């Protein structure tokens, strides 16, 4: 038994459906909203759980020329699998690893003057191609970046003394673009104020999903949409303000493997935490918190053949128990997360149950779930355990 | 070839393989006449099923348990020749793959076994090893009545290809006080005593293996305690054995900043300093399994206890620090000690969950760096 060429096999009835056509459709919404901007598709964190390689490849087939990721590992993973678009690493590379970024033609973020000096000291001469750099400006977020104009200017002057270093881009990031209030306006003005005190690079970018949906920002020539490429609004506020429709791309599915009848007194799962009072039927699903369906999901509702059914007892590492009508039997499929916003199984409802935001619900989905990709009538599978 | 031994962000898990071997050896010493069926499901509770199983085989392990056939096949592809039991329910259509790869399966019901027989094509002619699951009170998978148990064995006995290798059950409340565990154990014996006995008889998880002998059983299924964690505080308080925690979660500071009074940090402006205070940016976030709820917890930067402030992002965490902290300083987010403000159990309290889930949350983006004496090995799954 060896690695599959085209589609990985899988041997448990629990999986993610990933709609690639939905993702392309959402990408096309953004390029239509911003027809004179490069759409720098954010595919960090394995494309928010969907699969960075498959998504990037599909987006390239639909005109994408630039991607952003969090780490160099994520960028190298894209390169190993044939992605030839430009890639920006948004996080801070360790200076000792500078030669690997140059070798693989990956653009890096400059967060400070000190970093840039360390990075220069670690350039061996063995990789002689150009190093593309995007300078991060802190305009009030308080995270990564240069916050003062003098330092910004000094960094550009350093880059200009080395023919190997290219000032490719400058960028910032919004803290509160998905809530009402003036902070986003103020950050945008500050960003312009700084960028106007120096020579301008090829790429100027500031907008995440929320900023791309709420503002033009004519000054910028590129956008960095993440979560909304995959079909989710970054907040309720944004969803309510904008008229564009986004298509959710994920379903989370599992099939019932056994049904049982509990008599009054009998309990289910760890800690005897649900005790039957009547004759009630239960269904066992082969999915649990090691898959990202966390323990707190106890008491939520899932969709078994159209019927709304309560998750009862403790969610285990590998199993979930569901209270069901008598007609439910082994083999019936269950929607745990649905590809619709207005659903009791929406990502947002699951997020409310987990006391978190949609972003985290998607990132929780573990390596043990196969991803089954849909592209028209084509179907292919990634199962990380068998790669 | 991959670059899976390399990694390019300063955030990672240290996995102490000697600790794991040490804990395995504790269990075999507590149960000297039993096979220790090491539970390495869910990627060995986040440590890495392949590397752990391989290391345990080097230290005498002959039998493993996993949740799924995918997990079992993953072990076979990477050189594991021990016996493997799949604890979950295989889809009947996939029966030939279990036979081909010499993987034992769980029988949860009489109906499953009939479906499984119907899907045996004849192309894989080796024996199919079966362990019958008995539901003795847990209310999850398995057979709950003695007659059904007997009928299943009688079916297995009519086919030369099917072997009755084992019988087992599982405890619901072995980690809390009360009679339930005793009652389930007696029920298990009562059922097993009404039929011919198989080679393997097993009922004890970590908690059961630490609290009871169960002479009737000849194999144990310890999971979380192999990795150095007690299944509950109750068990920890009752038992005299010492378990060695095997995981650290580490990240290095990538940038420091000084905030003036008024200035804020992260999403939603949830934090403002009001005094000259220094912050450190860590390259780790909730996409790594360090969830948003960790805001307000404490981490260890060069010995100093420091508050996680602001929103935890997908890829970054912000920490309030003393002025002497600088880029490159390492930070312990989870520590390999039980009595630590960074213990797995304290992190579990913060997450309003149990230690099991804290470990399973740790995502594929974190490299695992294994220590075996002075030898070092790295898995970075992105660069397979
Ligand atoms: C995560 C991210 C994004 C995308 O944000 P969303 O569209 O998902 O809300 C854009 N820019 C940076 C930066 C820097 C990010 O870290
Ligand atoms: C998860 C598991 C175990 C191991 O449990 P812990 O020792 O980690 O608490 C043993 N047996 C079965 C079964 C059946 C399990 O699902
Ligand atoms: Cl435009
Ligand atoms: Cl013994
Ligand atoms: Na230059
Ligand atoms: Na969805
Ligand atoms: Na129970
Ligand atoms: Na037989």
From Swiss-Prot, chain B:
Instruction: Tell me what reaction this enzyme catalyses.
Output: L-alanine = D-alanine
Q: Where does substrate bind?
A: 140, 314
- Subunit composition? Homodimer.
GO molecular-function term, one example from the UniProt record:
alanine racemase activity
Annotated source species: Staphylococcus aureus (strain Mu50 / ATCC 700699)
Q: Which residues carry this modification: N6-(pyridoxal phosphate)lysine?
A: 41
Query: What's the protein name?
Result: Alanine racemase 1
What GO cellular-component annotations does this UniProt entry give? cytosol
- Which CDD domains does this chain map to? PLPDE_III_AR
Name the coenzymes or cofactors required: pyridoxal 5'-phosphate
Ordered alphabetically, the record's keywords are: Isomerase, Pyridoxal phosphate
- Which gene specifies this protein's sequence? alr1
GO BP, one annotated term? D-alanine biosynthetic process
Q: Identify which top EC class this enzyme belongs to.
A: isomerase
Listed HAMAP family: Ala_racemase
Which is one Pfam family of this protein? Ala_racemase_C
Q: What does this chain do?
A: Catalyzes the interconversion of L-alanine and D-alanine.
- Give the record's family classification: Belongs to the alanine racemase family.
PANTHER family recorded for this chain? ALANINE RACEMASE, ALANINE RACEMASE, CATABOLIC-RELATED
| Cross-referenced NCBIfam families | alr (TIGR00492)
Q: Where is the active site?
A: 41, 267
Q: Might you give the EC number(s) for this enzyme?
A: 5.1.1.1
* Keyword Membrane included in the entry's annotation: no
Keyword Isomerase annotated = yes
- Pathway(s): Amino-acid biosynthesis; D-alanine biosynthesis; D-alanine from L-alanine: step 1/1
PROSITE patterns registered for this protein in UniProt: ALANINE_RACEMASE
């Amino acid at each position: 038994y060896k690695k599959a060429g085209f589609s990985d096999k899988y041997y448990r009835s629990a999986y993610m459906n990933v709609d690639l056509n939905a993702v392309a459709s959402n990408f096309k919404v953004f390029s239509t909203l911003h027809p004179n901007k490069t759409v720098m598709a954010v595919v960090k964190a394995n494309a928010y759980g969907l699969g960075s390689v498959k998504v990037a490849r599909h987006l390239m087939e639909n005109g994408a020329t630039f991607f952003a990721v969090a780490t160099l590992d994520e960028a190298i993973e894209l390169r190993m699998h044939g992605i030839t678009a430009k890639i920006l690493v948004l996080g801070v590379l360790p200076a000792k690893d500078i030669d690997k970024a140059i070798q693989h033609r990956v653009a890096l973020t400059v967060p400070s003057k000190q970093w840039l000096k360390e990075a220069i000291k670690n350039i061996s001469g063995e990789q002689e191609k150009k190093l593309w750099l995007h300078i991060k400006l802190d305009t009030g977020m308080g995270r990564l970046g240069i916050k003062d104009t003098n330092t910004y200017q000094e960094v550009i002057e350093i880059i200009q003394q080395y023919e190997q270093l290219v000032f490719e881009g400058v960028f910032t990031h919004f803290a509160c673009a998905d809530e009402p209030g003036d902070m986003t306006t103020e950050q945008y003005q500050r960003f312009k104020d700084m960028v106007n005190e120096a020579i301008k690079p090829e790429y100027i970018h500031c907008q995440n999903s929320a900023g791309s949906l709420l503002m033009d920002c004519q000054f910028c020539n590129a956008i960095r949409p993440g979560i909304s490429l995959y079909g989710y609004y970054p907040s309720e506020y944004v969803q309510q303000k904008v008229k564009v429709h986004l298509k959710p791309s994920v379903q989370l599915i599992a099939n019932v493997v056994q049904t049982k009848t509990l008599q009054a007194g009998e309990s289910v799962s760890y800690g005897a935490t649900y005790t039957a009072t009547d004759p009630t039927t239960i269904a066992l699903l082969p999915i649990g918190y090691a898959d990202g369906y966390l323990r707190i999901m106890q008491g939520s509702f899932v969709n078994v053949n159209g019927h709304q059914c309560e998750v009862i007892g403790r969610v285990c590492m590998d199993q979930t128990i569901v209270k069901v009508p008598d007609q439910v039997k082994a083999g019936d499929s269950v929607i745990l997360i649905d590809n619709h916003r207005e659903s009791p199984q929406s990502v947002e409802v699951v997020a409310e149950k987990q006391h978190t935001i949609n972003y985290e619900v998607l990132c929780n989905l573990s390596r043990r779930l196969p991803r089954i990709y849909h592209d028209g009538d084509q179907r292919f599978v990634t199962n990380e355990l068998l790669k």
